[PDB]
Protein backbone atom coordinates (compact mmCIF):
# COMPACT_ATOMS: atom_id res chain seq x y z
CA UNK A 1 0.00 0.00 0.00
CA UNK A 2 2.69 2.43 1.17
CA UNK A 3 0.51 5.36 2.16
CA UNK A 4 2.35 8.32 3.74
CA UNK A 5 2.77 8.16 7.51
CA UNK A 6 3.76 10.88 10.01
CA UNK A 7 7.33 10.09 10.99
CA UNK A 8 7.34 12.26 14.13
CA UNK A 9 6.10 9.81 16.75
CA UNK A 10 8.47 7.18 18.15
CA UNK A 11 6.88 3.88 19.07
CA UNK A 12 8.41 1.02 21.01
CA UNK A 13 7.42 -1.29 18.16
CA UNK A 14 9.02 1.11 15.70
CA UNK A 15 5.82 2.36 14.15
CA UNK A 16 4.59 1.91 10.60
CA UNK A 17 7.54 0.62 8.57
CA UNK A 18 10.63 0.61 10.73
CA UNK A 19 13.49 -0.42 8.43
CA UNK A 20 16.53 1.22 10.04
CA UNK A 21 19.72 1.25 8.07
CA UNK A 22 22.12 -0.66 10.35
CA UNK A 23 19.85 -3.68 10.83
CA UNK A 24 22.72 -5.87 9.64
CA UNK A 25 24.77 -4.38 12.48
CA UNK A 26 22.33 -4.21 15.40
CA UNK A 27 21.24 -7.78 14.76
CA UNK A 28 24.81 -8.75 15.56
CA UNK A 29 24.22 -7.36 19.05
CA UNK A 30 20.77 -8.69 19.98
CA UNK A 31 21.36 -12.23 18.74
CA UNK A 32 24.70 -11.95 20.51
CA UNK A 33 22.64 -11.16 23.58
CA UNK A 34 20.10 -13.87 22.74
CA UNK A 35 22.49 -16.81 22.46
CA UNK A 36 24.40 -15.20 25.32
CA UNK A 37 21.19 -15.19 27.30
CA UNK A 38 20.10 -18.76 26.70
CA UNK A 39 23.21 -20.77 27.53
CA UNK A 40 23.67 -18.53 30.55
CA UNK A 41 20.20 -19.46 31.74
CA UNK A 42 20.40 -23.16 30.84
CA UNK A 43 23.43 -23.69 33.05
CA UNK A 44 21.82 -21.74 35.89
CA UNK A 45 18.64 -23.78 35.65
CA UNK A 46 20.69 -27.00 35.42
CA UNK A 47 21.07 -27.81 39.18
CA UNK A 48 17.38 -27.01 39.63
CA UNK A 49 16.36 -29.80 37.26
CA UNK A 50 16.00 -33.41 38.33
CA UNK A 51 14.87 -36.80 37.14
CA UNK A 52 11.32 -37.45 38.29
CA UNK A 53 11.12 -41.23 38.63
CA UNK A 54 13.81 -42.77 40.79
CA UNK A 55 14.96 -39.97 43.06
CA UNK A 56 14.67 -42.06 46.26
CA UNK A 57 14.30 -45.71 47.15
CA UNK A 58 11.02 -47.55 47.45
CA UNK A 59 12.31 -48.64 50.87
CA UNK A 60 12.26 -45.00 52.00
CA UNK A 61 8.66 -44.47 50.91
CA UNK A 62 7.55 -47.81 52.37
CA UNK A 63 9.13 -46.83 55.68
CA UNK A 64 7.28 -43.54 55.34
CA UNK A 65 4.06 -45.55 55.04
CA UNK A 66 5.23 -47.44 58.12
CA UNK A 67 5.59 -44.12 59.93
CA UNK A 68 2.11 -43.25 58.68
CA UNK A 69 0.73 -46.38 60.30
CA UNK A 70 2.60 -45.62 63.54
CA UNK A 71 1.10 -42.12 63.57
CA UNK A 72 -2.42 -43.13 62.62
CA UNK A 73 -2.73 -46.00 65.09
CA UNK A 74 -1.73 -43.60 67.84
CA UNK A 75 -4.54 -41.31 66.80
CA UNK A 76 -6.96 -44.23 66.47
CA UNK A 77 -8.44 -43.54 63.06
CA UNK A 78 -11.06 -45.60 61.23
CA UNK A 79 -10.68 -46.30 57.52
CA UNK A 80 -12.26 -44.20 54.79
CA UNK A 81 -14.88 -46.88 54.19
CA UNK A 82 -15.64 -48.02 57.72
CA UNK A 83 -18.99 -46.93 59.11
Amino acid sequence: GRYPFPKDVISMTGGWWANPSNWKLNGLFATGIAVGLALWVSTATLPYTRRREGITSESDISKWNAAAGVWRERHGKISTGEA
Binding site: A18, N19, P20, S21, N22, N26
Partner: protein
Protein backbone atom coordinates in the same frame (compact mmCIF):
# COMPACT_ATOMS: atom_id res chain seq x y z
CA UNK B 1 14.40 -3.00 -2.22
CA UNK B 2 12.69 -3.03 1.18
CA UNK B 3 12.85 0.82 1.35
CA UNK B 4 15.17 1.41 4.28
CA UNK B 5 14.36 3.97 7.06
CA UNK B 6 17.30 5.91 8.63
CA UNK B 7 19.70 4.28 11.08
CA UNK B 8 19.22 4.24 14.85
CA UNK B 9 21.87 3.70 17.57
CA UNK B 10 21.51 0.45 19.46
CA UNK B 11 22.18 1.38 23.07
CA UNK B 12 19.36 3.82 23.59
CA UNK B 13 19.54 5.36 27.10
CA UNK B 14 16.69 3.34 28.51
CA UNK B 15 18.19 0.11 27.16
CA UNK B 16 21.24 1.01 29.23
CA UNK B 17 18.99 1.79 32.23
CA UNK B 18 16.91 -1.41 32.11
CA UNK B 19 19.71 -3.83 31.20
CA UNK B 20 22.34 -2.34 33.51
CA UNK B 21 20.09 -2.18 36.56
CA UNK B 22 18.50 -5.62 36.06
CA UNK B 23 21.63 -7.59 35.23
CA UNK B 24 23.57 -5.77 37.94
CA UNK B 25 20.92 -6.89 40.40
CA UNK B 26 21.27 -10.48 39.20
CA UNK B 27 25.06 -10.28 39.51
CA UNK B 28 24.58 -8.81 42.98
CA UNK B 29 22.26 -11.68 43.90
CA UNK B 30 24.78 -14.28 42.86
CA UNK B 31 27.52 -12.23 44.52
CA UNK B 32 25.60 -12.86 47.72
CA UNK B 33 24.96 -16.52 46.94
CA UNK B 34 28.75 -16.73 46.68
CA UNK B 35 28.66 -16.23 50.46
CA UNK B 36 27.02 -19.55 51.29
CA UNK B 37 30.36 -21.01 52.36
CA UNK B 38 32.70 -18.04 51.91
CA UNK B 39 31.07 -16.17 54.79
CA UNK B 40 28.26 -18.40 56.10
CA UNK B 41 25.71 -15.60 55.66
CA UNK B 42 24.88 -12.84 53.23
CA UNK B 43 26.85 -9.64 52.90
CA UNK B 44 23.82 -7.45 53.55
CA UNK B 45 22.93 -9.31 56.77
CA UNK B 46 25.99 -7.63 58.29
CA UNK B 47 24.28 -4.34 57.50
CA UNK B 48 21.21 -5.55 59.36
CA UNK B 49 21.39 -4.54 63.02
CA UNK B 50 17.99 -5.08 64.59
CA UNK B 51 17.57 -4.91 68.31
CA UNK B 52 17.20 -8.28 69.97
CA UNK B 53 13.68 -9.09 71.09
CA UNK B 54 14.49 -8.84 74.79
Amino acid sequence: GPELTPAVPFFQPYVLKWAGVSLGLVAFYQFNSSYEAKNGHTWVETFFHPKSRE
